Design a protein around this ligand. Structure first.
Ligand SMILES: [Fe+2]
Ligand SMILES: [Fe+2]
Length: 215
């Protein structure tokens, strides 16, 4: 509740709020492109929205106004990349962007946030991190099941959006530090999460190396 933390919390908290609204909208949109799995998607969606409320509460708790503008342009480049794939019915990219890259970013950041969160906030985030492991898994089940048809596009979707997360990660860097998040942990933990995610899908270790290398 000091001067500097709250400021850092105004944008970071805004980032998780925006990420969550966005994640909500993206699952409802995937729902349409993949109708056979529509309502377990719908549930991933309607789940995302209770996260948004969750993280609004943590800001109100500390008595801080989120900076939605910052957040919304924090996310501009990905969302529009997602949207441009939705509009082409390219569902593979939409899954790579949202379920693998976006959730792995979340999984790594929260696990890093929890040990340093002030007490009300580590309660909800432990509550959320449970739920994103499942979101990552869904994108993981689907992609692994269609790996052969999906791989050429996955490869292309990776080089186009993986550079954007690193910019996102480097932007957070400073405001994460004053929240007690050591940037090397963010950096280290997202790559391992994503790398494991790629391997599980059907990518070999050498391939995976090549893909990470676009940051
Ligand atoms: Fe979420
Ligand atoms: Fe999620």
């Amino acid at each position: 509740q000091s001067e500097s933390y709250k400021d850092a919390y105004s944008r970071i908290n805004a980032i998780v709020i925006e990420g969550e609204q966005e994640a909500f909208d993206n699952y409802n949109r995937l729902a349409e492109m993949l109708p056979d799995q529509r309502d377990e998607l719908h549930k991933l969606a309607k789940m995302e929205q209770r996260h948004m409320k969750g993280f609004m509460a943590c800001g109100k708790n500390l008595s801080v106004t989120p900076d939605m503008g910052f957040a919304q342009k924090f996310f501009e480049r990905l969302h529009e990349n997602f949207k441009a794939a939705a509009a082409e019915g390219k569902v593979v990219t939409c899954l790579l962007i949202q379920s693998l890259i976006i959730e792995c970013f979340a999984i790594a950041a929260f696990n890093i946030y929890i040990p340093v969160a002030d007490a009300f906030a580590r309660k909800i985030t432990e509550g959320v991190v449970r739920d994103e492991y499942l979101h990552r898994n869904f994108g993981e089940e689907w992609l692994k099941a269609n790996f052969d048809a999906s791989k050429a596009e996955l490869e292309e979707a990776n080089r186009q959006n993986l550079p954007l997360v690193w910019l996102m990660l480097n932007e957070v860097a400073d405001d994460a530090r004053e929240l007690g998040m050591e940037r090397e942990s963010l950096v280290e933990d997202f790559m391992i999460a994503y790398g494991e995610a790629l391997e599980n899908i059907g990518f070999t270790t050498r391939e995976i190396m090549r893909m990470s290398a676009y940051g």
